[PDB]
Amino acid sequence: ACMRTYITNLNGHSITSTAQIAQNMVTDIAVSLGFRELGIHSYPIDTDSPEEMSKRLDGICSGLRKNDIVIFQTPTWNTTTFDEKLFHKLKIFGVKIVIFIHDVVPLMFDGNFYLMDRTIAYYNEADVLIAPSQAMVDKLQSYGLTVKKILVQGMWDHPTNITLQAVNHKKLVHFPGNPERFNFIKNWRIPTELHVYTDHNMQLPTTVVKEPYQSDEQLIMKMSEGGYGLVWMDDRDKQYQSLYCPYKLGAYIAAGIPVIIQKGIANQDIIEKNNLGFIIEKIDDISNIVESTTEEEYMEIVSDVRRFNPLVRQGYFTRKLLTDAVFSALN
Amino acid sequence: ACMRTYITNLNGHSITSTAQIAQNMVTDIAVSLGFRELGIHSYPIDTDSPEEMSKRLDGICSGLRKNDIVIFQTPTWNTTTFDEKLFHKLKIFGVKIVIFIHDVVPLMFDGNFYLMDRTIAYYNEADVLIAPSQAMVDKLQSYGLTVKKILVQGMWDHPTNITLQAVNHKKLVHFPGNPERFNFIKNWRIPTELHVYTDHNMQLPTTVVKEPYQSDEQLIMKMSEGGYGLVWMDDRDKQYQSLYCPYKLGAYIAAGIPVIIQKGIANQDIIEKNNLGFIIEKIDDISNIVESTTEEEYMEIVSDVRRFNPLVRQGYFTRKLLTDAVFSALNS
Amino acid sequence: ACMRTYITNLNGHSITSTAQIAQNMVTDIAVSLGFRELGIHSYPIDTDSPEEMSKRLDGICSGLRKNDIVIFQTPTWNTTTFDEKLFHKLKIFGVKIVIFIHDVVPLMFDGNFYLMDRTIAYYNEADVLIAPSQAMVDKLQSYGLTVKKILVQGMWDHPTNITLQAVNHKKLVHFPGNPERFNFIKNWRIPTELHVYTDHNMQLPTTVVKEPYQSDEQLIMKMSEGGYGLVWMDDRDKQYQSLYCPYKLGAYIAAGIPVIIQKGIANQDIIEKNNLGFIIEKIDDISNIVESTTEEEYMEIVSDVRRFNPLVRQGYFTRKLLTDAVFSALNS
Amino acid sequence: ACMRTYITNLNGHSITSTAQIAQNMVTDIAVSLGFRELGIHSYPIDTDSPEEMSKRLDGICSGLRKNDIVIFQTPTWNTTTFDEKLFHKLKIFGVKIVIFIHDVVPLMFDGNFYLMDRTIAYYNEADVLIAPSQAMVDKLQSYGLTVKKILVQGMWDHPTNITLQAVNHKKLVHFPGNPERFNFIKNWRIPTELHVYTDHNMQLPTTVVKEPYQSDEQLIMKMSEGGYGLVWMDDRDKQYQSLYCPYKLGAYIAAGIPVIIQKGIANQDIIEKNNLGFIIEKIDDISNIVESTTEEEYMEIVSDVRRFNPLVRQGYFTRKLLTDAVFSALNS
């Protein structure tokens, strides 16, 4: 008897690896619900003889029993080979398995696609699938994902205790994002200023206020003073990735300010149906609404962000999926 | 401005009160999820002046802050006047309210079907409701329940660490209800033994072999050695039949024995799609199937009930609604 | 018969109230330990007939059952009759009472003394007592505390997930208390500057700089840029100082900077043996040390304050007493 | 710098392995407190090469981080080799390490003593040690355990929800010990019955009554009905057993019945100061005391056993040590 719930969780990354922190946050929610961590360290697999890799995995999995539910946050970023072998280890236990997709590698870019057959093959060894969007599920099914049981994540949480402050109507735009991933910054043409929070040492266009990498808590603290959240991606290419959930979008709303997002985003409806800000087409549509928007137009939009965001702040999108995933994994 | 979640919880009913312990169980789940208790004692409120009363409530709610969330488990059994008075207090606080329906008082027994409209009245003020089933919601909106966000319970959990003994093919039928609430018991006609667990003494058709009320643990221990669980009503209430979730349906499945229940029950889809037992017309239909089933087809059903029940034994039907309810309360 | 643990937790006070904060905060640990809140609202008491109020007490306490455990965080700041009568309610239950002393209102400021004998009366009605320091238990004994089982708090935790930024050597002293309760502040003379975090802006010595009351979170960040935490009281309150636990003490150490405290203060050996700042005898011994301190010496001292402070940031002083209190309340 | 607590958890033993059952239960408690499991599987270490093992260990510790804290339930039963190396692994991380002793190999009997120096070697790499009895710590320090912070366990908890049946005065002695280890059983000559609960098929002396192994919950329910619980040694396995905490002792008390224990065993002061049973010289002293005891005396003895066992049923002896151990690991 006595079933337990385990969740994989990666470790050993740069303190700025967003993938790692996103897994770490989910795992944090998991523990409070009583679930148990399956630690996974990120290392180079080829340093391992198959037998060594095997028994490393036996070490990761030691605690497991015919019994349990395992939540697999994919990918481990130890390359596909690791995910593949991780799963077979899992599948030789008498367990139900939830795969929690954070990224889909063969869809990260064209010509990485070939990995799809392998990927889908191990995706289909799971009993329940949690995907960020309904869109993601539907293309994943277009490549042979057979799994009957599916959950939509909808939106990244952002558990925190930051102080929200009184929010001014500042006609600024926040963007905590590495500039060498998003070209649109280096192209900043507009009279409204782009606050850019980045560790990387360099200089930026004339009305782009470069700001050194703040610790998250402080970042949430500062942004809560006003302005807007920019959710842009990924510059030109890497855009059909209208699939996954942005982590900064959640990071914005938790601060308590409205957001701006480009049309077609994953789980767009959430933003409309909950008031959180504007969905626009071009970068230029934005400048217009930031420049030409009413002060109490802004007043409202905040009041709602802060109405909506205790979900994000106490982590309820995550609680939701970590609970139904399991439930649907039995029933 | 920091959200916490409270849930209302009964205290002071008898050892043998299902209403209280179904609520206590929910509460114990809520605690493990981090939620906080608004304790509520059951008493005649005729002994309160509608102001001493207000202050008692004020002391029930003194932990509450502004955009916390309250889960109200209804009913309180302190009478409708309390229910709505408890409730009205919550509306003062600028919070979001979850109404968890254990029972709708004015449907159960057509004495006091009249209280309905004051019930609905204080129902229509919550922000989301969690109800036994969709058919239960549907009948409620027919009475004017204007609440948009709904959410279906589906099944009672029965969280426990009780030992499951190997199930063998006792051609027994188990039944831990109360003979003069479920009076189809005094009408036993069939050559299949009916075991009945209850407070009331001295009432026996003949093959109804009755036993004294046992602590929940033991019941589930001994029921696990084999046989079938039965979930049935009088014709008295075959409408409320099709609405509620039964506690002993959950109390059977956690014992890891198959159940037999009446076609038209709320959420029979769960019994079917998870093959947890037989869905059947009349009680004769049952006895036939209890007689005609062979050893191996019973092995499948037990294995299926036992594939299924850690869900019920670890609190997940509850955990489910305790988490989505709070979620849909903020979302739109 | 299943033991649940309860803790009291006052509410409704000003978001600036340290009393409420040091209670909500402990309660918050207790919740995560699975304990349950007994919410309490702070209000002026005699808008209540002795019978009305008794029924609001009945509402705060409805969730209790015999053989539970209740932790009374005292005082409630609802005056001493409330402490007395609350406690009286707890004693008609078959329970064990942990009395957790956050303050002793009689030994606090003079004139409050007269309530001493009544306070000891209801102190002596609990099973285990939790006091800030052994020295405080000793004084309570001299005034008639007859409760056998004592347990020392030691220090306030300061749970937080705030950023500690790189600290060292700002040659400045930090002080987040109201100036009106410590007026050593106004007689500030010495050339090193005093940051003061407070509600007011009344008065202003030259080398004293003030800041508007920042939310706890942001404060600990800033303080974590270096400088010293000064734990001081105005010397009418030294009788008390040698007994209580200072919350700002923890707030400093939580930010990750070394402290300055006065000799004789409660649980000083804590500071000594974990090397978290200086113990000095006057204000002037202090400034002397704030100047004349090597960058290397400050280095290590910070290093020590941060070897140490996950204790207070994860709640372990609170977790410690909350566990042992309930234990000794049963063991003998 | 976010401190997390980890605890090692042995797995993959037979369901009758008390070692595993004890480590599992501590861990379940730990998990409730927010601590984190380091799972470990039991297996022949010889199937691994240095490289293989190093990496198996790597995978066990993947989640580990600097500034975390790890609690090592020792021994793993993967042999000393494995224990030494697991510890070497842990010391590589900049963490604080609590060592929870369940057994000490080089003391299990003579000739195993050569293992002492290697055992002590790695024991001394700990910051805090938790032993069952103060007696245990004293003996360890006579061999070179230089770890300055020690904490005492005292007694096994037994988290359970068994129904405590009404307890009659059954002049019989329960004993769920496996005979092959406890040979005093075979020597049973006494007119008082001896319930021996054992999975082994091997017939037993006359007024010994053999029960097949039963689930722990059923056992506890059975014994709750009444009678006495015996905690007895063997004779050679005795000195070493004066240092341990018996697990079945806690089984009794949680069951709700008094106990009978041989003079000198670890932590007997808990039995005496809490009324838990009799402490006696030989086997006969027992039968005497069992025969020559009145009914009201037994009501007494039970009522205080049931006074006391919420500690064990809710896991507080463990909660104590899991909280204070960790606290003491940061706190010089």
Ligand SMILES: O=c1ccn([C@@H]2O[C@H](COP(=O)(O)OP(=O)(O)O)[C@@H](O)[C@H]2O)c(=O)[nH]1
């Ligand atoms: O100075 C900073 C800027 C970044 N962030 C965090 O790092 C995340 C980076 O977002 P990323 O582009 O990696 O995720 P995405 O939104 O693209 O999914 C932000 O949301 C912040 O929470 C931070 O902690 N400090």
Ligand SMILES: O=c1ccn([C@@H]2O[C@H](COP(=O)(O)OP(=O)(O)O)[C@@H](O)[C@H]2O)c(=O)[nH]1
């Ligand atoms: O001897 C008994 C008989 C009843 N029960 C419990 O009380 C419930 C009675 O079910 P009830 O009819 O009151 O609930 P319903 O199924 O009608 O919703 C059973 O499920 C058992 O869990 C029990 O613990 N011991």
Ligand SMILES: O=c1ccn([C@@H]2O[C@H](COP(=O)(O)OP(=O)(O)O)[C@@H](O)[C@H]2O)c(=O)[nH]1
């Ligand atoms: O701007 C501020 C200054 C104070 N504090 C908190 O309020 C407490 C005031 O301490 P108090 O003098 O009331 O208690 P003591 O430390 O003397 O026990 C400090 O510790 C801080 O934690 C705060 O939250 N914001």
Ligand SMILES: O=c1ccn([C@@H]2O[C@H](COP(=O)(O)OP(=O)(O)O)[C@@H](O)[C@H]2O)c(=O)[nH]1
């Ligand atoms: O039928 C049985 C017999 C024993 N036990 C368990 O086995 C334990 C005793 O094991 P052991 O003698 O090894 O513990 P010790 O007292 O020596 O520490 C009991 O307390 C029970 O928990 C059980 O679960 N069912």
